[PDB]
Design a protein around this ligand. Structure first.
Ligand SMILES: [Ca+2]
Ligand SMILES: [Ca+2]
Ligand SMILES: [Ca+2]
Ligand SMILES: [Ca+2]
Ligand SMILES: [Ca+2]
Ligand SMILES: [Ca+2]
Lengths: 115, 115, 115, 115
C-alpha cells in the first residue's frame, strides 16, 4: 500500500471500525476528483486504496466520515468530518499512513511517511 | 466572540503567531461562501471574526493556513492546511473556540462550545 | 501566574471543571516534595498555584487526577492520571501553561512557555 | 503480546526509533517495581515486554524516555519523559497497545484495548 488509513476511537480505546473514508485528487480546475474509498476494517485500518502506479504526485484529500461514526455510537459529535489534505510524493513515492485519533469534540491526524 | 480561533506550536511550545485563518459558510446551493478572515495575534488568538447577529445557523469551515506557517520557519510540513468543518448554532446561539495544535506532520483540533 | 494548568474535556467540548491537580518538586534526595495543589475552575483553569519567588529552578511534576474526573461522569477511563514532568526555569524565570486535553482512553498535554 | 508500545514522531512523520521504554508494576508498598523494558524497533514498536502468564491485574506504569529521543535529534524537549499509568486487566486479560505521539512540547497517549 502506498496509502493506508488508520482510525482510532479515543472514547472506547479501540480501532474505529466501519468508518467511511473517501480519497480525492485535486483536478487541474481546482475541484476534487474522487480517487478511492472504503471503510475501515475491524482493526480500524483501510488498505488497498490505490497502487503506486496510480498514486502519482499531486494534492490529495482524505475525508473521514467521523460524524456517521459517532452517530452510530449514539454520541454527539462536533465535526462534520475530518479532512486531511496533503501534497504526495513531492520527493518520490514513499508509503503514507494517515492516522486519525477521534474524540467527539476533538481529533488529531498524523502522517507516518516511510521508505 | 461567538467565534474565536486559537493556534499553538507544539515544536516550540508557543502561540502560533500570524497564522492566516479563513472562514466559510455553506450556502443554499452547497457552495462555500467566504464568511470571515483574519490572522492570529501574538497570543496565538484570532478574535472579532464575526458578531452574534451575523453568525447564524449553518455549516461553517475554518481553514487554518498551517503550511505557510511552517514554511516561514524553514519547515516543509505534511499538511496543506488544517480544516475544521462543523454545524453551528443548531440548538441556539453558542460561543465556539476552535483550538489547533500544530506539528509539522501532525495536528489536533478541539472545539470548546459554551452557552 | 508563573504556573497555570488548563484542562479540557474532548468528549463534551467543554472545560474540565473541578479537576484536582497536585504539583511536586524533586528534592535534593530525589524524592518528590509536595509543592502546590488546587482544582480547576469553571473555565477549566487553575491559577495561583505559586509565585515567582517560590517557583525556583527544579524538576516539577504536575499530576492531574483525570480518573476521578471521568468516574464522576460515569466513565471508567484507561489512565489513573495524567502526569507532566519537566525542568523549570533552567535558563531563567518563565511562565508555564500546562494544557491537558482529556478523553476516556487518551490524553494529550501541551506546554506553552513564555518569557 | 498482551502489552505493546508504539511511538510516533510528529515532527518528522515517522516511527520513533530506539526510544527507551521502561515498564513498572506497583508493589504493595506503593513503590514502582521494574517489570520489563526495551527500545522501540525501526517501526517504532516494542513487542514481547511480558507474557499473559506474567501480566496479571495491577497498576502499571509505562515510562517513555522522550527526552533522550529529542536530545538525539538535536531538538529541545519540554518533558523529562512521558508516563502512562493504568490499571490492567480489571475485567480480564485483553491486549493493550499503548500508543504515544511525540512533539518536543506536547505528547498524546492512547490505549487501544482489544480482545
Ligand atoms: Ca497496507
Ligand atoms: Ca474573543
Ligand atoms: Ca436548528
Ligand atoms: Ca494566571
Ligand atoms: Ca540553570
Ligand atoms: Ca506484539
Amino acid at each position: 500500500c502506498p496509502l493506508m488509513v488508520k482510525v482510532l476511537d479515543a472514547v472506547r480505546g479501540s480501532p474505529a471500525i466501519n468508518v467511511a473514508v473517501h480519497v480525492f485528487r485535486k483536478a487541474a480546475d481546482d475541484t476534487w476528483e474522487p480517487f478511492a474509498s472504503g471503510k475501515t476494517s475491524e482493526s480500524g485500518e483501510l488498505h488497498g486504496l490505490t497502487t503506486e502506479e496510480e498514486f502519482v504526485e499531486g494534492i490529495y484529500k482524505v475525508e473521514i466520515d467521523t460524524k456517521s461514526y459517532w452517530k452510530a455510537l449514539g454520541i454527539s459529535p462536533f465535526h462534520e468530518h475530518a479532512e486531511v489534505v496533503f501534497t504526495a510524493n513531492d520527493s518520490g513515492p514513499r508509503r503514507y499512513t494517515i492516522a486519525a485519533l477521534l474524540s467527539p469534540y476533538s481529533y488529531s491526524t498524523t502522517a507516518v511517511v516511510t521508505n
